[PDB]
From a paper:
CD163 is an archetypal scavenger receptor and mediates detoxification of free haemoglobin. Detoxification involves haemoglobin binding to the abundant serum protein haptoglobin, followed by CD163-mediated uptake of stoichiometrically diverse haptoglobin-haemoglobin complexes into macrophages for degradation. CD163 contains an ectodomain consisting of nine scavenger receptor cysteine-rich (SRCR) domains linked to a C-terminal transmembrane helix13. The CD163 ectodomain adopts an architecture consisting of a ‘base’, formed from SRCR domains 5–9, linked to a four-domain ‘arm’ (SRCR1-4), of which two or three domains were ordered.
To determine whether the HpHb binding site is pre-formed in the absence of ligand, we also used cryogenic electron microscopy to reveal the structure of unliganded CD163. The other two three-dimensional classes revealed dimeric and trimeric arrangements of the unliganded receptor in which the arms of neighbouring protomers form contacts with each other. These classes were not seen in the presence of the ligand, suggesting that the ligand can compete for the formation of these interactions. The base, formed from SRCR5-9, adopted a similar arrangement in the unliganded dimer to that seen in the liganded dimer. However, the arms were in different conformations. In the dimeric unliganded form, SRCR2 and SRCR3 of CD163A interact with SRCR3 and SRCR4 of CD163B. The surfaces of the SRCR domains which mediate contacts between the arms overlap with those which interact with HpHb. Contacts between arms will therefore compete with ligand-binding interactions and the arms must move apart to create a ligand-binding site. Interactions between arm and ligand will be in competition with interactions between neighbouring arms, providing a mechanism of autoinhibition. PISA analysis shows that the arm-arm interactions have a total interface area of ~590 Å2, while the dimeric and trimeric receptors have total contact areas with HpHb of ~930 and ~1445 Å2, suggesting that HpHb will effectively compete with these arm-arm interactions and explaining why we do not see these auto-inhibited CD163 conformations in the presence of ligand.
Numbering used by the authors:
A (entry chain B): 264 to 689, 718 to 926
B (entry chain A): 152 to 689, 822 to 1030
Amino acid sequence: LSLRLVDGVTECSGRLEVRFQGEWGTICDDGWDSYDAAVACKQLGCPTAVTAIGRVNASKGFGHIWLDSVSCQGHEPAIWQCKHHEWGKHYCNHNEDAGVTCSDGSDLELRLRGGGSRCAGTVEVEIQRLLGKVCDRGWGLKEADVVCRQLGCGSALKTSYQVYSKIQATNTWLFLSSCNGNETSLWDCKNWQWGGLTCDHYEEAKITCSAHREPRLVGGDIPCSGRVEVKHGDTWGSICDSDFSLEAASVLCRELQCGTVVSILGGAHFGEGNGQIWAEEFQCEGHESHLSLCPVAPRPEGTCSHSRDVGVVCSRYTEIRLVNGKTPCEGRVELKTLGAWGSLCNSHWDIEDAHVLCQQLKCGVALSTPGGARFGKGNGQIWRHMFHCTGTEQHMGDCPVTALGASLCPSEQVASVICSGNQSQTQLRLVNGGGRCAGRVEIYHEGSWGTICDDSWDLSDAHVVCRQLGCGEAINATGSAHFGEGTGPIWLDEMKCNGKESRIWQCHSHGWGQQNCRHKEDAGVICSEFMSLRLTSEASREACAGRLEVFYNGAWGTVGKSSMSETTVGVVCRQLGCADKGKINPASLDKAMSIPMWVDNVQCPKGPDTLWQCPSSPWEKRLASPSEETWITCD
Amino acid sequence: SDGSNLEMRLTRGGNMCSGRIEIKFQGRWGTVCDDNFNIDHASVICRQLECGSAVSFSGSSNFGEGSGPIWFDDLICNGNESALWNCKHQGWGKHNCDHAEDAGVICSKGADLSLRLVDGVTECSGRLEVRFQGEWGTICDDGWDSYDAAVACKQLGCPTAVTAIGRVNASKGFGHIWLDSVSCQGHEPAIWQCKHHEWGKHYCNHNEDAGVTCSDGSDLELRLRGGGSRCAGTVEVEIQRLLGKVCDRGWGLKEADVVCRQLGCGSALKTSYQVYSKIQATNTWLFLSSCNGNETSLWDCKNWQWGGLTCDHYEEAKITCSAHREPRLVGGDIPCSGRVEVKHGDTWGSICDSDFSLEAASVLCRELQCGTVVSILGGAHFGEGNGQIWAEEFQCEGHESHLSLCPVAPRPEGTCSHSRDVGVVCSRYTEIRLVNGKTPCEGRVELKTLGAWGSLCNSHWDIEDAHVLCQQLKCGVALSTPGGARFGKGNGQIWRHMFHCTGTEQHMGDCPVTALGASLCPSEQVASVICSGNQSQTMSLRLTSEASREACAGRLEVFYNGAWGTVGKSSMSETTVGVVCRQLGCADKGKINPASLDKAMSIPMWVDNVQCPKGPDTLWQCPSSPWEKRLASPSEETWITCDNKIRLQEGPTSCSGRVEIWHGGSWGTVCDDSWDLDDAQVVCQQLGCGPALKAFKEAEFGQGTGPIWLNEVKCKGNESSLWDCPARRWGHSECGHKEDAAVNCTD
Ligand SMILES: *[C@@H]1O[C@H](CO)[C@@H](O[C@@H]2O[C@H](CO)[C@@H](O[C@@H]3O[C@H](CO)[C@@H](O)[C@H](O)[C@@H]3O)[C@H](O)[C@H]2NC(C)=O)[C@H](O)[C@H]1NC(C)=O
Ligand SMILES: *[C@@H]1O[C@H](CO)[C@@H](O[C@@H]2O[C@H](CO)[C@@H](O[C@@H]3O[C@H](CO)[C@@H](O)[C@H](O)[C@@H]3O)[C@H](O)[C@H]2NC(C)=O)[C@H](O)[C@H]1NC(C)=O
Ligand SMILES: *[C@@H]1O[C@H](CO)[C@@H](O[C@@H]2O[C@H](CO)[C@@H](O)[C@H](O)[C@H]2NC(C)=O)[C@H](O)[C@H]1NC(C)=O
Ligand SMILES: *[C@@H]1O[C@H](CO)[C@@H](O)[C@H](O)[C@H]1NC(C)=O
Ligand SMILES: *[C@@H]1O[C@H](CO)[C@@H](O)[C@H](O)[C@H]1NC(C)=O
Ligand SMILES: *[C@@H]1O[C@H](CO)[C@@H](O)[C@H](O)[C@H]1NC(C)=O
Ligand SMILES: [Ca+2]
Ligand SMILES: [Ca+2]
Ligand SMILES: [Ca+2]
Ligand SMILES: [Ca+2]
Ligand SMILES: [Ca+2]
Ligand SMILES: [Ca+2]
Ligand SMILES: [Ca+2]
């Protein structure tokens, strides 16, 4: 008895044969596992580093079939010392004659071809200088992550490429049984078959790993803004302002974990780069988790100038730390804004915000908020930001934040949080009214948002609604669908609140779902902390020019001109929706209403698009001369 | 030798139908070399040893060493031969194989084949497994249908009353796939005895493993869940003890009709259901393929599949049968009139007045084949029920076929007591019968009017009217209308209704009819019709007064023959005065009063003794005495004062309270949307109370009763009639009864 390989590609590849009684026959495919191949290559003079089953390059054999159902365990010195069934005692057709491929691991290569970069394309496997593809047999993302990890390109996203289908065709295929998604190389996947079988009705395997179009923000004053860069494989390049869109920025900031897009800026706003410039039009739908999944139009024949880079500013720009604590997960809150650190007041600081704060720093569910200055009094600037987190947001930048006109507080009233430090630890809104503290009232119950009926809806009910929402007292409890009809269920019909209840559902009502109303009687509230902005002038052709008026506590007022800057007028103009910059103007037209001025000394940081997050002096309702009133004109 | 003395034997095998081939010749046993051995030789061999259907052929050491000479070599054989020695060969005893172990064969009758079911919800259910060469393998479901499943169940030994395909609750097995494309015919004693692809490790890929579910029919149930009753919702099945849904591969109305018939809810209308509840998820599904449509149950369909696939890219099947909300008219003195009752699946209830609109009445009269709606009555006109009082509002649009398709808005327990049940009067109220005929398709025409039957007068009777009459009685086209007393003279009143059917009407009540001033005719001139029997065959009125203080409070004049004339007072009843008042544009009530102001023109009379039946709203359909222009004294001349169309109700005094307006036979309310001073001014202009000073909202004087007619009234402030102003007229008002309007005015 003796073994041999025939019509492979080296001395240790191809169809396997055994001589019995003096005649040369083959082994059957059934029962042929990696252990059997290891035993066979141990018997032969071949390396045993990688021992894979399969008939690379081999055609249908010829002769007798002499063995089948080989059940070796890797503890025997020959293929025929195993628990073979019986000599010539079974049937296998000649299309499933056995084969092996054995290597020392020095010439087994994998590469993706036919794509925009090395991490997207059809998978091509080169074994012993023979090049072929991989067939889709359970080829999921779980299988694909092994290949992406082996190549060094992030994690797999989808099984498809885009460009350059001009790939050389071959008739040899690689078959994967099942892999855990846990291995470092596809060669470590259990029982992968090389060649022999052919697969029709089944196409080649496709890959696009995450490192195909990695985005990055390079230079900016605040954490999540700057010039946009994309990595083509191994090389970094900037993006033209022409080939970009709001959806592209949204998916870019979703990939980088920086929240929803708040600003897209043309021109070298953050500085001209030094590198390659791509011309690749992104056509993102907007729901993709990565830029790699974005379909991209092919390159045109034109090229941009380097001074045409595009920049992005996104929501999550809030820098908060804990200081003066025994551990990093306990201490006093300090927030960076406008260029300096400082402590945080606890006028509107509660547990719901501490949860999000300790989820930002990965310290688990918040435990308590010690009062006074238990971890230390303030020794500098005190920021008066009131955070109104619901509690489910993952970062303080997602929460609604108000800093305009905030009221001061003494240094002995600074917030601080102590937290568990264990990572493993883990219901009312206003809509369609504009802003957060005015509009139709909606309540969450039974997994759905519903409305409150108009009947018996008076100002005392809006007191409780806006006390729960943190908007202070109410000014209007409106009905008859003032802000528009809703959609969905109606949860509560009659309100008999005292006006002192802590939350809305402490109120007396007929019971959940006990309603006799329709969607034209939806309830709405307008409250003290409602803010709106406008520009007024007398019968002009343009509306975005004139006197700045802010709405607060139900009354209009003007804004002081002291300490104004270009960025403040810019954010005001953006909020009104007319331009991204503007210029202050003297007291024009020498005529206006004598309404007083509500707030003065407004300072804006980079990143907010709404004036409400610009810190300023506390509210004051005093009369001012037309010299102190602010007039702006936006371009 | 002709081959009679030769004999063949199977040796060293598992049994008689297995092993090495041996042939006896010249007193010596010998074997046959395996050169050029194919399935044809095996088929030939497994024919004369009585073991049939050659399964496998072997070679070399499959059956050990042979002994003796070798008789045959390099034989060529066909697939159908009498014996192995009937083939062409080089010669007896001639061979050049240079081998020692010879050929062996395995026929079906000796192979240790067996069949079993695994991974099932019962002893016999789930995936099929067949033993071949000692290994258990699966069957690919390429062309795996009910006949094969029946054969499998019969072989297994468990009941064959209902046999279905599909692997329920079973996962695809790992191993060989021994059989593929089985084509059993429904009587074979075994699955492998049929025609099937040759035993081999198939690569069948587009398909999955095969399995069966056999049952006796007493453990299969079908239900609907998520709907408003047992006859609406998503369809759920319970086979053995496992629940599932039905995928909508071919879920047509022809498919849903079978389900509705099985449940008993009449017929299928729609493939969607308004959702009253959330239903749980379920892993296994049921699949169908083009049932005939006349099947009594879904278990008698063709090759339905239970399990085996996950219905993705397709959604669950859902239906609403006719019995979901089945209407009925009860307590009526005439057909197509009475109190409305609705069956909610299997219970009858009476509906409340405020939940019904004219569109709902139209759809009800259409579904009952009762025609258009002529009036909606409230306040238990036909009497109050004695059962449940459904409290769901109907949001019907027009042109709907059944009351089940309507959207429905549920409400809490009803505020209304049992004395607010609604009723309807539709259009087809004409009772006609054919009497004194050998068959109901021919005979005398009797018409039921007032409270009695009578013989219709054939003065204006024509063939088109007979066509309509016999289309009503489902008797097809009428043949002829015999004259004279062909079927016997009348035995009572002779109604003189004049029917003017066009010819295409489906009911005699949809034809125009006139009975006022209808001339008399003798006892022998009486109508009667005979028909084929093959069912498949197919005037003005006004009220005058010296001054027009109101609009309907004066002397009555009828227009005929180009002149006006007053109407007699003899036998004037409440219903006749109501009909006149309603026709002339005021509420459905009035009172007759003696002549006033004694200055009406001395116009002659036209008609006397006018009696009006229930159901018609126009005066021309009321039987009476024939026209005559006799002069009449003012003592016999009629004067009527009708109730106005706009009243104020529940107010502490007159000229104040809730606005109620009459239409469609019922008193409805006015919604408070855009209820301001101009509309109140118009309202108190119609009523003779003078200028208004305030308009009220949200049912200040009391919550109303009935439908709602007007919405978003936008009077300019000087319109003569509130019903001249714009508004969402005739319902559609999206207001409850907490929005009833009210007016206060200067006395
Ligand atoms: C797949 O297997 C076939 C054999 O069935 C290989 O074909 C033969 O490969 C051998 C190398 O083992 C070649 O022998 C040498 O070829 C060169 C010329 O190419 C000559 O200089 C040497 O004297 C010697 O003959 C042989 O030519 C070649 N024959 C053919 C017809 O291809 C084949 O190489 C294998 N596949 C691949 C991709 O290598
Ligand atoms: C769905 O298929 C599963 C397997 O894929 C079936 O699992 C097992 O089925 C048995 C009855 O057939 C269940 O009851 C067991 O019965 C025996 C006696 O007959 C007893 O020894 C056990 O203690 C138990 O009562 C068994 O729980 C069940 N096991 C599991 C993990 O499901 C199953 O019957 C099929 N149907 C359903 C509805 O799951
Ligand atoms: C509700 O909002 C309305 C406006 O939508 C307010 O009515 C105005 O209130 C101002 C006071 O700032 C008065 O000068 C105006 O004359 C009012 N207009 C009208 C048409 O009445 C009202 O104050 C708000 N609050 C309440 C309780 O009604
Ligand atoms: C993942 O791979 C590691 C490295 O060999 C191994 O120890 C571990 O068991 C694997 N885990 C699983 C779930 O396969
Ligand atoms: C149902 O109708 C089909 C033709 O549409 C007919 O072949 C079949 O026999 C019918 N079945 C029954 C049970 O009447
Ligand atoms: C109607 O108005 C009059 C006149 O102002 C007033 O005296 C009377 O009380 C009012 N009626 C009601 C029911 O309010
Ligand atoms: Ca093995
Ligand atoms: Ca209301
Ligand atoms: Ca209410
Ligand atoms: Ca209240
Ligand atoms: Ca079949
Ligand atoms: Ca209203
Ligand atoms: Ca109006």
